[PDB]
């Protein structure tokens with residue numbers, strides 16, 4: 001129990017570095033599964049067409065150096081540890097309407113003996129929305145959220161959507177708006193600094209409509 | 213006309229389709245401009261794409277005349 005967990009945590013971090021990618025050979029590309037969970041629309045600014053939403057960004061990846069044998073620690077096969085203690089891909093929202101990056105809370109991660117990490121930090125995103133002016137009335141807007149690693153490019157870390165659609169299983173509906181459609185799309189983007197290596201992003205969007 | 217394109221990764225050169233006779237390059241700054249430089253979009257077009265206040269678009273009619281800004285055209 002708690003006696004063994006304390007033990008294994010000390011063991012795991014006695015010689016650990018959160019500054020280098022958790023792969024045995026630097027040629028390896030870290031595979032990170034990313035899944036956006038929409039929790040609640042908390043603010044709607046119709047003049048600027050900005051919506052503030054409460055979300056959670058579920059991230060999963062394996063840390064080569066964080067493995068162990070359950071038998072060596074009283075059968076413990078999983079433990080919770082502060083996210084600040086390990087390497088993280090630094091996935092960020094970068095089309096935050098007000099600020100240039102969203103509000104986030106570094107919650108604990110779930111780590112199992114195989115080195116598999118599950119991190120689901122909550123965040124407050126501010127997104128610009130585009131009015132869908134196809135049909136009258138124009139009571140529909142398309143809000144997007146672009147996510148990608150702040151520093152690493154596609155040859156170091158690869159983010160892959162957990163699903164084609166954001167997770168709305170824990171979404172608290174509004175009494176005045178409804179989410180009609182929502183999807184995430186992965187893109188390979190090139191920047192002027194780098195002609196050969198693309199930077200990756202997963203952009204999630206949701207179309208919301210005012211109820212009659 | 214053969215044009216460079218960012219529709220593929222890595223960037224590649226493709227025979228532009230019927231109707232598309234221009235090669236173009238669009239660049240603009242996003243939140244990472246100070247470090248990665250401007251976003252680069254390359255492709256084929258029938259007519260030069262509209263430019264925005266925050267977009268920089270250039271068009272041309274020679275083979276591979278729209279390379280990544282860090283590479284020679286042609």
Ligand SMILES: *[C@@H]1O[C@H](CO)[C@@H](O[C@@H]2O[C@H](CO)[C@@H](O[C@@H]3O[C@H](CO[C@H]4O[C@H](CO[C@H]5O[C@H](CO)[C@@H](O)[C@H](O)[C@@H]5O[C@H]5O[C@H](CO)[C@@H](O)[C@H](O)[C@@H]5O)[C@@H](O)[C@H](O[C@H]5O[C@H](CO)[C@@H](O)[C@H](O)[C@@H]5O)[C@@H]4O)[C@@H](O)[C@H](O[C@H]4O[C@H](CO)[C@@H](O)[C@H](O)[C@@H]4O[C@H]4O[C@H](CO)[C@@H](O)[C@H](O)[C@@H]4O[C@H]4O[C@H](CO)[C@@H](O)[C@H](O)[C@@H]4O)[C@@H]3O)[C@H](O)[C@H]2NC(C)=O)[C@H](O)[C@H]1NC(C)=O
Nearest residue numbers: 142144185186187188203205218219220221222253254255
């Ligand atoms: C609300 O606002 C939202 C935000 O603005 C808005 O979101 C946008 O929605 C649209 C959809 O409506 C999104 O458009 C799609 O984008 C997809 C992803 O685009 C990126 O990736 C592609 C592909 O890159 C891969 O493939 C090439 C080679 O083809 C490689 O070179 C790459 O390395 C890469 O390879 C990996 O991935 C492959 C899988 O695709 C693997 O095979 C491979 O092994 C690798 O793993 C790039 O080309 C894109 O580049 C373009 O865009 C960037 C920047 O965005 C530019 O810089 C660049 O110059 C290019 O312009 C980009 O990086 C597209 O894949 C997807 O394309 C399909 O649909 C379109 C149109 O419908 C077709 O023209 C196209 O041919 C594709 O067709 C296939 O899929 C459709 C289904 O949609 C089928 O109908 C069709 O028959 C065909 O099917 C075949 O292929 C399928 C797989 O692709 C397969 O499933 C089928 O079985 C079949 O074989 C499309 O363009 C857009 O991204 C969103 N934008 C954002 C910002 O999120 C939303 O619309 C708004 N909503 C409303 C209601 O208003």
